[PDB]
Design a protein around this ligand. Sequence first.
Ligand SMILES: [K+]
Ligand SMILES: [K+]
Ligand SMILES: [K+]
Ligand SMILES: [K+]
Ligand SMILES: [K+]
Ligand SMILES: [K+]
Ligand SMILES: [K+]
Ligand SMILES: [K+]
Ligand SMILES: [K+]
Ligand SMILES: [Mg+2]
Ligand SMILES: [Mg+2]
Ligand SMILES: [Mg+2]
Ligand SMILES: [Mg+2]
Ligand SMILES: [Mg+2]
Ligand SMILES: [Mg+2]
Ligand SMILES: [Mg+2]
Ligand SMILES: [Mg+2]
Ligand SMILES: [Mg+2]
Ligand SMILES: [Mg+2]
Ligand SMILES: [Mg+2]
Ligand SMILES: [Mg+2]
Ligand SMILES: [Mg+2]
Ligand SMILES: [Mg+2]
Ligand SMILES: [Mg+2]
Ligand SMILES: [Mg+2]
Ligand SMILES: [Mg+2]
Ligand SMILES: [Mg+2]
Ligand SMILES: [Mg+2]
Ligand SMILES: [Mg+2]
Ligand SMILES: [Mg+2]
Ligand SMILES: [Mg+2]
Ligand SMILES: [Mg+2]
Ligand SMILES: [Mg+2]
Ligand SMILES: [Mg+2]
Ligand SMILES: [Mg+2]
Ligand SMILES: [Mg+2]
Ligand SMILES: [Mg+2]
Ligand SMILES: [Mg+2]
Ligand SMILES: [Mg+2]
Ligand SMILES: [Mg+2]
Ligand SMILES: [Mg+2]
Ligand SMILES: [Mg+2]
Lengths: 102, 61, 89, 65
Amino acid sequence: MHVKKGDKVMVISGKDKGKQGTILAAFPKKDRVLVEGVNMVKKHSKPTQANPQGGISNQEAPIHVSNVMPLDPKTGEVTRVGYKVEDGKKVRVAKKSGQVLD
Amino acid sequence: ARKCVITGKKTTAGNNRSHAMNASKRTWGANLQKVRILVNGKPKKVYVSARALKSGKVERV
Amino acid sequence: KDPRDVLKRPVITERSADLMTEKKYTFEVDVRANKTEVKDAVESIFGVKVDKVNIMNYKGKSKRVGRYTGMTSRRRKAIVKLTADSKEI
Amino acid sequence: KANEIRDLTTAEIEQKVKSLKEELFNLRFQLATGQLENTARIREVRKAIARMKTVIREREIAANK
RNA sequence: GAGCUGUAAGCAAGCUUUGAUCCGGAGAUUUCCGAAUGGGGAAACCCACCACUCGUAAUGGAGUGGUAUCCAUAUCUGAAUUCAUAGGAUAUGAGAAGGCAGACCCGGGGAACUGAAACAUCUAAGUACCCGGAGGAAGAGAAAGCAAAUGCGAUUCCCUGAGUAGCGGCGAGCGAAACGGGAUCAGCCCAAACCAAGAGGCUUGCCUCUUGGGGUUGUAGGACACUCGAACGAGGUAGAUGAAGAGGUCUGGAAAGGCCCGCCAUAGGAGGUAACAGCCCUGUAGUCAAAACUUCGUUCGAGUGGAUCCUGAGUACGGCGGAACACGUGAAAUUCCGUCGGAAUCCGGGAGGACCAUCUCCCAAGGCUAAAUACUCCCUAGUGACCGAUAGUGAACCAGUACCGUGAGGGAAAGGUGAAAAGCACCCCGGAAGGGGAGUGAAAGAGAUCCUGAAACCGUGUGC
RNA sequence: UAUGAGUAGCGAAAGAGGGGUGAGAAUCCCCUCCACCGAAUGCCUAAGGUUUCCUGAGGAAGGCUCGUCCGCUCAGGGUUAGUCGGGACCUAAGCCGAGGCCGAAAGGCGUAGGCGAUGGACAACAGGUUGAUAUUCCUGUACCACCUCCUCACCAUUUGAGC
RNA sequence: UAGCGAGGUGAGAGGUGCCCGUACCGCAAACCGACACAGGUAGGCGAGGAGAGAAUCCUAAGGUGAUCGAGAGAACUCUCGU
Ligand SMILES: [K+]
Ligand SMILES: [K+]
Ligand SMILES: [K+]
Ligand SMILES: [K+]
Ligand SMILES: [K+]
Ligand SMILES: [K+]
Ligand SMILES: [K+]
Ligand SMILES: [K+]
Ligand SMILES: [K+]
Ligand SMILES: [Mg+2]
Ligand SMILES: [Mg+2]
Ligand SMILES: [Mg+2]
Ligand SMILES: [Mg+2]
Ligand SMILES: [Mg+2]
Ligand SMILES: [Mg+2]
Ligand SMILES: [Mg+2]
Ligand SMILES: [Mg+2]
Ligand SMILES: [Mg+2]
Ligand SMILES: [Mg+2]
Ligand SMILES: [Mg+2]
Ligand SMILES: [Mg+2]
Ligand SMILES: [Mg+2]
Ligand SMILES: [Mg+2]
Ligand SMILES: [Mg+2]
Ligand SMILES: [Mg+2]
Ligand SMILES: [Mg+2]
Ligand SMILES: [Mg+2]
Ligand SMILES: [Mg+2]
Ligand SMILES: [Mg+2]
Ligand SMILES: [Mg+2]
Ligand SMILES: [Mg+2]
Ligand SMILES: [Mg+2]
Ligand SMILES: [Mg+2]
Ligand SMILES: [Mg+2]
Ligand SMILES: [Mg+2]
Ligand SMILES: [Mg+2]
Ligand SMILES: [Mg+2]
Ligand SMILES: [Mg+2]
Ligand SMILES: [Mg+2]
Ligand SMILES: [Mg+2]
Ligand SMILES: [Mg+2]
Ligand SMILES: [Mg+2]
């Protein structure tokens, strides 16, 4: 995927359009990611052995990976992603500036 | 196998034909005679068509 | 073959626990293992003396999980009686 | 790992194989009795044995050629 | 190149930038049954012998390997029987066996319904089917040909000839070929004289057989005489890189849509993304890439004479009986089979649709041979005025399943929550099922019997 | 999906009451008396079935009603052999069948040799025990084959015991 | 007997003894009959009274009360009695 766990991204599509957050988890198999503070859901959980209160709980639900873009290091605007090789090691680059993301 | 050990002659299919030209299946048998001959320099009773014996090249033992 | 190929696991049931009072130990064994091989293996592994081995075959139980029918594995159970002058397993 | 296993002699491997098969046996018993916490260990030992038997067999093939 | 431990949630325990999971090349392991092959057997089981090894005091037990049959080869034995042979034993064999495309191919065997407005010749049809043999193709093939020209020059296949010529209870029907135009093109090796060497029978110097040379044909030729493993390149099997808008704004749960503006384009294929995206993602065009295995390509002994001799024999051919030829026994050439008879051999032989003569063209009775052609169980990429869940495969789904049948065999039904499980905490009636609220959601009359939700059919209410 | 229709049927048979369990009881459990089979409707055991067995829990469907129950659902559990039956023993009919004989092919037949119980042969009995096995486990008392680290007795090492 | 044969024979003592089946139903609601179906299903044992008896009727050991019931007691139909 063009983003990965730990990347700062901007949500470019959905109810959370224009909201930035960190990727808390990636789901390559589903092409979804979990972004902090984005796409919150109210899960109605019964009492279990783990959580014996139960209750309604606000948690992030994952969004499609194509609805987030990484931010340009220089300008702080969304960027498409390229790849160059530095020190015999491939790195992502912000196509907007040229700056390395990671 | 009813086959000549020299020539390979064997039973072959074809028709009877009546005067009314009705066809029914029959066979033609080779005129095989069981006879002692050398088969790999070993005397053995094998089937040989009369035709293969006609010359006298196939020598009985 | 290794002795530890022969014995698979102990059988822990109420029956098996009652037999352990009589100095009889129940194991599941390799379904190919004859009772001599089991005797040899129990003496080799645990350093005990075996009086007798009795042995039985269980068929697989037919089973269901939702819409899919199948069959548990065949089992060979050995009941190993140790001699009276012997260490316990 | 196999890189480390290849440094050993065949006899030394065959001892480690014997040692691991004892470990596997004991784990299987602990699992049966419900004592074993680290169940992941079973898989590791099985694959260790496999790794070793692979190295042994590579040497047999290397010799018998 | 950052996640992963499949479906499959979940807990659990772990793994992974000291490179995991994952993808490709090459290996290793690969229980038992199955040709199944140590012997047996009701497949997936049982029972052995021989080595060697573990274990036992020893028996019993365990492990590894070997042990089918037939064929070929070699060796050793050599019955009745003297030699001998049959037979036996041993060893060596990546020798055979079996499966499989429901296809295509070549053979052996070979129907009937049906048509003929009945039916027997005839048709259906050399079809279906069974059997044998294959090969990636097969078969055919280098003139004893076609023809009747100033000729042609192996075979196969396509077009055409032509529904012609013909065959035909001259009925029903069956039905060519050559010429001409194309596809593709390629030619060769023996047998025989004869020579050399060797062995064998000596028949007693004649003949036989093995090996090598020789030789290969038609207005003849020949013999026989004389004369001159690597290297590199492009592919395949993983991949890499890859332009351009969260443009503003409207509606909306969400914008890829509207409106107003930009931009890229060797890229406006495609799929995805909360509604319809060249510019969001995966990609696409283009350009690159391989340790390994693999495919393809590229490079690194002749004339002139003709005394003789040779040139495929139980053959060609013929009679009788059948079959194949488009051709049904006919005026019946041509090809093959069974049976019996049986040539010539260059001063020779075959064919030109009975047959003869003349002429013309050929040289049989030995073998090999690519391409053009056929087909698709598969794999890769793609396409469709093809189907869209009673359709399309029998099978969109755990289907050749369930179920039926002793068996061969027959053979279904069954797709759709939502963008996301956010899959309804909590309260209330109820044993539960199921409801009513409350929540979630754009929607719950989307709550799993979950898109839409017709009709039949079943109800409740009531205006006449 | 109707109609027929709340209709035909609910598959030979003796129950009654008291108590219990439970949301619920003609139908489940217990008790009592009554009744039925008894050359069986009892006990054992083939074939066949294949977990239906035992225990605990369950009640949607199955059960011609009901259901708290069940041959049903879900969990666990349960089958112990030198001596029983079968194999490592024997053969019958029949079947397979090295070579072989016969046959368009496929194959058919068949010898040596095998396979093949429904038969022959062959060593364990009584008692006890579990929720669920018992000539199998346990107790007691046996028997059969084979083996020799050992013991004793006897016989004999080639007109030499023994097998 | 042919053979084999230098060690044997007998009795103790010690020891060795594998695989497959074993649950449960089995005149049955578990098998064959599409059914928890008045049918079919080889064999062993099969008590007492009266009796020739395995008949018969009533019982023993043992097993069972049968998977819709409650009424009413018409026609008619069935099976019975007079
Ligand atoms: K006909
Ligand atoms: K998107
Ligand atoms: K002829
Ligand atoms: K003719
Ligand atoms: K269908
Ligand atoms: K009676
Ligand atoms: K119950
Ligand atoms: K036995
Ligand atoms: K039993
Ligand atoms: Mg891009
Ligand atoms: Mg047993
Ligand atoms: Mg075998
Ligand atoms: Mg007709
Ligand atoms: Mg060919
Ligand atoms: Mg890219
Ligand atoms: Mg929509
Ligand atoms: Mg010739
Ligand atoms: Mg003519
Ligand atoms: Mg539909
Ligand atoms: Mg369909
Ligand atoms: Mg069946
Ligand atoms: Mg609606
Ligand atoms: Mg929709
Ligand atoms: Mg709907
Ligand atoms: Mg009524
Ligand atoms: Mg009623
Ligand atoms: Mg009526
Ligand atoms: Mg009525
Ligand atoms: Mg009624
Ligand atoms: Mg009843
Ligand atoms: Mg029960
Ligand atoms: Mg009911
Ligand atoms: Mg027996
Ligand atoms: Mg036979
Ligand atoms: Mg044979
Ligand atoms: Mg018997
Ligand atoms: Mg006995
Ligand atoms: Mg019992
Ligand atoms: Mg029993
Ligand atoms: Mg019955
Ligand atoms: Mg009877
Ligand atoms: Mg009586």
